[PDB]
Amino acid sequence: AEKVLVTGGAGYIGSHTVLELLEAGYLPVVIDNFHNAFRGGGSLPESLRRVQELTGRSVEFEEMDILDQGALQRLFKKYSFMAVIHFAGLKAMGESVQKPLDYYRVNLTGTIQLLEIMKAHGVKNLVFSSSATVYGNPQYLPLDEAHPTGGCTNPYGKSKFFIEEMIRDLCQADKTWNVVLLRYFNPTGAHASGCIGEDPQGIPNNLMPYVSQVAIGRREALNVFGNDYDTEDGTGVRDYIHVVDLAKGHIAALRKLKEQCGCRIYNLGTGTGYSVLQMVQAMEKASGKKIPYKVVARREGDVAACYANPSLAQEELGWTAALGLDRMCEDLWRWQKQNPSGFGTQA
Amino acid sequence: AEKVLVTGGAGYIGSHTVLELLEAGYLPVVIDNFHNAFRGGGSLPESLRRVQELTGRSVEFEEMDILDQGALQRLFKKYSFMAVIHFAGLKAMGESVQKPLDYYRVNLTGTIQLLEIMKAHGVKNLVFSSSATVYGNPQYLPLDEAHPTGGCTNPYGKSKFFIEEMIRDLCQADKTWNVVLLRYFNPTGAHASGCIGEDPQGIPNNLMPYVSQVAIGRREALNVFGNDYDTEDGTGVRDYIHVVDLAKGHIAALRKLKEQCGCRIYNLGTGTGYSVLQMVQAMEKASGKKIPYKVVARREGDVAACYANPSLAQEELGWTAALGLDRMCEDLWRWQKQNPSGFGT
Ligand SMILES: NC(=O)c1ccc[n+]([C@@H]2O[C@H](COP(=O)([O-])OP(=O)(O)OC[C@H]3O[C@@H](n4cnc5c(N)ncnc54)[C@H](O)[C@@H]3O)[C@@H](O)[C@H]2O)c1
Ligand SMILES: NC(=O)c1ccc[n+]([C@@H]2O[C@H](COP(=O)([O-])OP(=O)(O)OC[C@H]3O[C@@H](n4cnc5c(N)ncnc54)[C@H](O)[C@@H]3O)[C@@H](O)[C@H]2O)c1
Ligand SMILES: O=c1ccn([C@@H]2O[C@H](COP(=O)(O)OP(=O)(O)O[C@H]3O[C@H](CO)[C@@H](O)[C@H](O)[C@H]3O)[C@@H](O)[C@H]2O)c(=O)[nH]1
Numbered sequence A: 001a002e003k004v005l006v007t008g009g010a011g012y013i014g015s016h017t018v019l020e021l022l023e024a025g026y027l028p029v030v031i032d033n034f035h036n037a038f039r040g041g042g043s044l045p046e047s048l049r050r051v052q053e054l055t056g057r058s059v060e061f062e063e064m065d066i067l068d069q070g071a072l073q074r075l076f077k078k079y080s081f082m083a084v085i086h087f088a089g090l091k092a093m094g095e096s097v098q099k100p101l102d103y104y105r106v107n108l109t110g111t112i113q114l115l116e117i118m119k120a121h122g123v124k125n126l127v128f129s130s131s132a133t134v135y136g137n138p139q140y141l142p143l144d145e146a147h148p149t150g151g152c153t154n155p156y157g158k159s160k161f162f163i164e165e166m167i168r169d170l171c172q173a174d175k176t177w178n179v180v181l182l183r184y185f186n187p188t189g190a191h192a193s194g195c196i197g198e199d200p201q202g203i204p205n206n207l208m209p210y211v212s213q214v215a216i217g218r219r220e221a222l223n224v225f226g227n228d229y230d231t232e233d234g235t236g237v238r239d240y241i242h243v244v245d246l247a248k249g250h251i252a253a254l255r256k257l258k259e260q261c262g263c264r265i266y267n268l269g270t271g272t273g274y275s276v277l278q279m280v281q282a283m284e285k286a287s288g289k290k291i292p293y294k295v296v297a298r299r300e301g302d303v304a305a306c307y308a309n310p311s312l313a314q315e316e317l318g319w320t321a322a323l324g325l326d327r328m329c330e331d332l333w334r335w336q337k338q339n340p341s342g343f344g345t346q347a
Numbered sequence B: 001a002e003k004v005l006v007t008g009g010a011g012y013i014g015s016h017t018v019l020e021l022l023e024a025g026y027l028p029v030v031i032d033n034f035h036n037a038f039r040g041g042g043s044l045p046e047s048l049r050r051v052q053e054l055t056g057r058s059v060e061f062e063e064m065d066i067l068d069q070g071a072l073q074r075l076f077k078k079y080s081f082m083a084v085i086h087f088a089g090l091k092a093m094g095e096s097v098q099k100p101l102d103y104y105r106v107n108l109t110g111t112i113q114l115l116e117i118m119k120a121h122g123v124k125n126l127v128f129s130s131s132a133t134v135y136g137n138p139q140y141l142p143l144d145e146a147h148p149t150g151g152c153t154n155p156y157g158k159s160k161f162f163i164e165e166m167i168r169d170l171c172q173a174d175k176t177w178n179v180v181l182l183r184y185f186n187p188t189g190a191h192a193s194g195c196i197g198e199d200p201q202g203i204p205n206n207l208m209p210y211v212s213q214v215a216i217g218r219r220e221a222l223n224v225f226g227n228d229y230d231t232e233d234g235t236g237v238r239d240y241i242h243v244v245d246l247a248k249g250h251i252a253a254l255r256k257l258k259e260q261c262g263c264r265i266y267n268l269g270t271g272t273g274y275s276v277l278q279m280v281q282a283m284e285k286a287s288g289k290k291i292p293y294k295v296v297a298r299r300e301g302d303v304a305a306c307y308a309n310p311s312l313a314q315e316e317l318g319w320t321a322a323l324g325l326d327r328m329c330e331d332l333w334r335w336q337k338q339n340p341s342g343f344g345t
């Protein structure tokens, strides 16, 4: 059978997706450069070594940068891929605005190169990791796929938007390409085993890991970025979606490609928004601990509220986000508790 | 530090700009991969060999591709540049729609690689070849720099808008950078000598060269892409600008970078629009030849009318186009008549 190439497969979403793929009968080939993934004691990234244990299935992996043309070409020559799931890229530690060229090089040129290599090797089926950030500051809610895109605040979001645009044109020009662009909302939670999860390096830039870190006792209090937004409690509102559900949406995307779907774009969210305080409260409930916090200044570029309109995906992808808030918090807690300091090499 | 790097300098606008640079006292270093330039009998592209003869000044040239990181590194180590004028890229031969990846690779990846090397070497002064196509279908006319941009119809135009956006971001992130983004309208004409000019290969996609080719007798008749637009005569209207004035605008941009201006954007147009038929007529006058034409269907994605609001460039850049229609046509004809097969065969 033909393989599925997973770029950035050792990361948060990627590792969860590799797990889903293995369970569903697929044969992935994963690549990662360790830019934001922990190396295990062996060749495999720790996250994937664990996915191998969890599934009882082998993970084919190669350490490689998507920017390395020769390595990528050799890879496409060695295997017969039927599709590519592209997670590799830079996300922001609120860094993008300051290092635009890094985002443009890694995300933009990296993806252009991948598309070129794909085309040359006759692989024209892609699943791309997009984001709700491409919608920019919401002009209305909930955010449906028809909401305007572009006009993003930072280089990270613009990079995502430019990539979407490029893929849309590619599909427009060549009807033989099939591409599913998945606009993720705010992924959270972890695999139910508690063995893998989000493994941030240093001080977490995103909410959830910070909250869990407070709950576990690593951090004293959560810093709440502004409480004067035009939301019910004044704190930011987001559509948190269980990483497992998100991962499963990728399998749905592969099925969609098989229908010779052309270019399709789908939001991957729950359709339900929760504020910062609400997430804190849910974490107190999951963890059985009080979670202190302090209100500080707004974070540059933060939007008031963002949540998806998930109907298109339910309809066309035949997918829905099955896990609720308590599940997300309980799963995140299990991962946090079982792995107080994230991933580590085997003892 | 001292020299000015000119990418794609062997092309139409680039060669004319190289000439202007030389006459103004600058020292250019030109790079080109010959993707759309004719090779002379020697090292230099024919256009540049001619520029050298016309100015009596030497042209420093290096055959290379902007997509080659290794060559860029060597180049930046070899010379000390104070600024870069970036013309290299793929234009559409109405091709963009059908070959997106080529456009994105050359225009996007090539520009990003260039920006990275510039940054690495501390050469944070750029002049970029943008286009009025970034405005998309005009919402109002004339087009001023404040008109909305983006939401372009093609991979080519999209590529231009994406590049502008990247540059804006870069300037935001690093206040030391200076960048002048030049939105050209419809470049036409040629150097007064008649020795250099646009050298299209095959059937021209743009109006003027097609028109001149009909006049010289290379083409039977001009196909007019629709005569039912909401223009005074039903045919498409454009702001034709003489390539010599356009080239001079680049020198004004260079001076602007010296002010430590950050990111600035200017239209490079005359502010006067002319229809397909007006251009044909003016060409008949200039050439003394008849230019038969046939009205055909509208061309995919064509806009009815597009022309610039040249105020900002006059005010801030201190520049205005001086040459008019008759001069553009006179110069275009001279080039075509004197060089029936372009630079060579
Ligand atoms: N986490 C979110 O909330 C979120 C929301 C929006 C969209 N996304 C996108 O989904 C994707 C996955 O996000 P994530 O949370 O799992 O991030 P992550 O950082 O954990 O995963 C990305 C993986 O890519 C790898 N990588 C980075 N640069 C690479 C390169 N040049 N070559 C090869 N591998 C490289 C990293 O080492 C990492 O393992 C990213 O493209 C991200 O932009 C994530
Ligand atoms: N002519 C127009 O109507 C028009 C309109 C607006 C903007 N522009 C832009 O202005 C610039 C110059 O246009 P032009 O009419 O002179 O076109 P041109 O094709 O004559 O000049 C571009 C030059 O770049 C060179 N080149 C292409 N790819 C290269 C690469 N990878 N590395 C090095 N050199 C490379 C080509 O060989 C050519 O000599 C381009 O960026 C074009 O998109 C032109
Ligand atoms: O220490 C923190 C972190 C976050 N927040 C707030 O919590 C909310 C969520 O913030 P964060 O987790 O950083 O999420 P977002 O900025 O919404 O971005 C996440 O989700 C986006 C999709 O909506 C993706 O594009 C991003 O990559 C991803 O990190 C916002 O209201 C933040 O202001 C705090 O108050 N304190």
Ligand SMILES: O=c1ccn([C@@H]2O[C@H](COP(=O)(O)OP(=O)(O)O[C@H]3O[C@H](CO)[C@@H](O)[C@H](O)[C@H]3O)[C@@H](O)[C@H]2O)c(=O)[nH]1
Pocket (backbone or CB within 6 Å): B091, B092, B131, B132, B133, B184, B185, B186, B205, B206, B207, B208, B210, B222, B223, B224, B225, B226, B235, B236, B237, B238, B276, B299, B302, B306
């Ligand atoms: O054989 C031809 C060629 C052109 N036209 C018409 O002539 C006009 C000019 O056409 P063309 O020379 O192809 O220019 P544009 O369609 O305006 O596109 C140009 O103008 C933009 C700025 O306005 C630049 O950015 C582009 O790169 C440049 O190709 C239009 O109304 C065309 O419909 C014809 O009728 N027949």
Ligand SMILES: [Cl-]
Pocket (backbone or CB within 6 Å): A040, A041, A042, A043, A044, A045, A049
């Ligand atoms: Cl291992």
Ligand SMILES: [Cl-]
Pocket (backbone or CB within 6 Å): B040, B041, B042, B043, B044, B049
């Ligand atoms: Cl020579």
Ligand SMILES: [Cl-]
Pocket (backbone or CB within 6 Å): B002, B003, B078, B079, B080, B081
């Ligand atoms: Cl030098």
Ligand SMILES: [Cl-]
Pocket (backbone or CB within 6 Å): B098, B099, B100, B101, B102
């Ligand atoms: Cl292509």
Ligand SMILES: [Mg+2]
Pocket (backbone or CB within 6 Å): A309, A310, A311, A312
């Ligand atoms: Mg719906």
